[PDB]
Amino acid sequence: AKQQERTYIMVKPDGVQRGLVSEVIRRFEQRGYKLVALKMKSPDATLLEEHYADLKGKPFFPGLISYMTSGPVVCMVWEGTDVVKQGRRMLGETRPLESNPGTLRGDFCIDVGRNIVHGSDSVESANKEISLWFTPEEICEWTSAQHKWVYEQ
Amino acid sequence: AKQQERTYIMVKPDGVQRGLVSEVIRRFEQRGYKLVALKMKSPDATLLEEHYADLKGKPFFPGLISYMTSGPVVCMVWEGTDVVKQGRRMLGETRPLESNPGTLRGDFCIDVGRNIVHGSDSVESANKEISLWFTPEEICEWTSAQHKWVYEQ
Amino acid sequence: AKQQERTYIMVKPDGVQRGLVSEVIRRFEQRGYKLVALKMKSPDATLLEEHYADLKGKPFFPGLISYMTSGPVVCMVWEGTDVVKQGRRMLGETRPLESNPGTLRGDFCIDVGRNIVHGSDSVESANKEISLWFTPEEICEWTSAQHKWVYE
Amino acid sequence: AKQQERTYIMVKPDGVQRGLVSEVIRRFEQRGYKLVALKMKSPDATLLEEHYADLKGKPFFPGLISYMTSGPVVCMVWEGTDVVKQGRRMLGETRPLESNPGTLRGDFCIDVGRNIVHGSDSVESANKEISLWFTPEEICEWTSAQHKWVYEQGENLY
Amino acid sequence: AKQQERTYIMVKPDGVQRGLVSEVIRRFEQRGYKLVALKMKSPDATLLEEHYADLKGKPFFPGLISYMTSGPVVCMVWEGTDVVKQGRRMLGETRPLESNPGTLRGDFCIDVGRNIVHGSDSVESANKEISLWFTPEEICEWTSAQHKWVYEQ
Amino acid sequence: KQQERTYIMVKPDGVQRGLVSEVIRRFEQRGYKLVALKMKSPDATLLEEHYAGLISYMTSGPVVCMVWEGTDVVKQGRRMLGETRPLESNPGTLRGDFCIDVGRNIVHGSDSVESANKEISLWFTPEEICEWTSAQHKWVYEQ
């Protein structure tokens, strides 16, 4: 069951605009994490408001939703051991100015509000996010040919 | 109307297995072409049989369909001037042994039956393929920040 | 004589805006060619009008000049055997739609009017271009540590 | 203003000799920092002596000046929020043996005396360095097409 | 003398299977370390048991040896100042889940049992490993053209 | 068919210029299988047979010797290296991306299957060939 952990990764509108979709996918793909769902979407405010439900009511919330509807996003689900936490380490710290070289934000970003990508903060949050952005039918079950070389039996 | 041209690009099951999704996307993204639709899918045989309708009744057709259902694929639509023909030039010749270094198949492939990616062969094919794989609601309308720097006025 | 050939390479305002300066430099640097002059510049119209003198009078000319002053450019001189021709090959055809994958234009662009970079079309052209865009004191004389491994 | 902060980055003779000019530029360019000045130069000993003014008197000083005049350098000015501090971070520690993988020095260097690049250590030093290595006429202002995607709305805009 | 320090680096079977030989070499080559010995080998269990002598008796030991003989390895010797310590830092922590982005394991690995590469842990163990895996006749003496630009003399 | 092998060698200039990883990458990423590899300082006698001023350069530093396996690897290998003369080679090839002089063209590749078999047996012993099966075999090749 451990290798079956999943996380939700989203390239934010700035990531798409700046031509960083392939780079975000590369960090996960080259690591041995398995891509099990993927779509480009122009979500409406209602969907984004549920994604960010924990931030409702905060003064910056309306601006956040407006910004998140200003361009398309790329939604992904990745599967593998500890992918939630590893996913977060690969993105960098929330603030690019605190992120290290070698991370996505540390390599490509400057402002916290333009930090190109979102990753689930916990397995529980991942499960919520995955079900919000994808139907079960959109999640593609497959077995990697490199499984026995990425994981110990 | 020439900038509006679109083509259908699909990472085949071998491209997904070999971890080349990011590389295929990169070739288009870095060129200035605009990603307008994207999804991972496990298509059933009926959708693939329509995609490959012109090959129906060829002796290799059954094996092609079985192969194309042997892992997930990544479906994409790219937009920009001459994208059908340029997309094909970037993929390389159909046969990897005839493809030049610098092209996707020339860099990454050996066998014509394991040639990692599909690109529409013509504007007519592209229009058919786009509407076969995607509904209009899955196509994302957006304007790239770099438009005026990729295209002349 | 051969090894001292020089060409003029210029990242155009779209190349700079699209963050392709490092990539243009890499194609030459990794090839073993020697960078002997480099500067970012905002040329005035009078210089651009001399650079494009043969085009003066064409309907698109004023627009070309305004476009070429719309952002800074990166000016370079590269040195090495057959650098003019090899530089043009590495850039790809002038028209990106006719340029092959593996070339700068084949990899990165689409419209001939947004074709990110210029390289001299011949040694004759290079001599003219280098003299127009650089002063002799801006050319840096040096010997590469890999010279004996790049050249026989 | 915050977004207008600038730093001086210089590829040292070893960085040029080892073919690392493009890689140094890439780290800044891909990050959204704006290149506003750039030139290759073979500076006179006196310019370098002024650049390292506060190292005069040190036994290694003559040696440092001779080394820094041993090949051309590439001078740059980069602009963006926190560019001085982020620039240093991207370069890695001064000592390559203390620098982490992913930084320029950690990926490409071994010896502190051959550490390929210099970055201003502070805003004060950066302004001094920019003025020493470039004239105001060499600074080429511009606004990036990607500005609104690299930066959020700036605060206290008049 | 300090510039003459050497370490033993080995791409394990998973690193070879996953196509990561060029990437391991790149990390050392681009840093200015000097490659002085290199070979692909399918070692006998006897050689591996001596390599892993400190682990004899552990319950996983027989399984480790059978794993390490399940595909070829690539053996290397690198030379330069502090290469043992720097080499380990470039590989990352033993555990990929603790390794930082930018390191080999942090970029490409997930399971500690499939952590693609080995590096000597000390000058003492490096000297033992080098003489275990290579004869003196396989070590190539040469001087890099970039020596005076990598090192201050 | 898929068992075809070729001999690729990084010449002393390729090693000196830090291009070993890149030569390996071009073959590795293509799906070709590395079955033999070694760094060596061959003597004049091995070099004279191989080539039956050149011998001096070819002994001026170490080389990296390789055997790659896969369908059409001799011809595809040559294509990936580029034309013998770098000034005739296209961008995307190793010599077209990294070289200028024919006498400093960083790499050698067998020109035919017959030459490859001869070169492999000249530069490697049978015991140095490592046979294995790639986990990606069924995705690189059609059954």
Numbering used by the authors:
A (entry chain F), B (entry chain B), E (entry chain E): 3 to 155
C (entry chain A): 3 to 154
D (entry chain G): 3 to 160
F (entry chain C): 4 to 55, 65 to 155
Direct quotes from the study:
Nucleotide diphosphate kinase catalyzes the movement of phosphate from a nucleoside triphosphate to a nucleoside diphosphate (e.g., GTP + ADP –> GDP + ATP). In both structures, TgNDK forms a hexamer with an average BSA of ~18,900 Å2. Comparison of TgNDK with known crystal structures of homologs proteins suggests that the TgNDK hexamer is likely a biologically functional assembly. TgNDK adopts an α/β/α sandwich fold with four β strands and eight surrounding α helices. The side chain of Tyr160 is spatially positioned in a nucleotide base-binding pocket of the active site of a symmetry-related molecule (not shown). Crystal structure of TgNDK suggests that the protein forms a hexamer with conserved nucleotide binding sites. Pairwise structural alignment revealed that active site of TgNDK may undergo similar conformational changes as its closest homolog, humanNM23-H2 transcription factor. On the other hand, when the dinucleotide is absent, the active site loop comprising of residues G59-F62 (Tg numbering) is shifted significantly (3–4 Å) between species. Additionally, TgNDK residue K60 is residue R58 in the human ortholog, offering different hydrogen-bond capacities to putative ligands. These observations suggest opportunities for the selective design of TgNDK inhibitors using structure-based molecular modeling techniques.
Toxoplasma gondii is one of the most significant parasites that impacts human health, with estimates that as many as one third to one half of the human population are infected. At the Center for Structural Genomics of Infectious Diseases (CSGID), the first Toxoplasma Structural Genomics Pipeline was established. The enzymes selected from the TDR database as small and tractable for expression and crystallization included: phosphoglycerate mutase II (hereafter referred to as PGM), nucleotide diphosphate kinase (NDK), ribulose phosphate 3-epimerase (RPE), ribose-5-phosphate isomerase (RPI), and ornithine aminotransferase (OAT). The genes encoding these enzymes were cloned, proteins expressed and purified, crystallized, and crystal structures were determined.
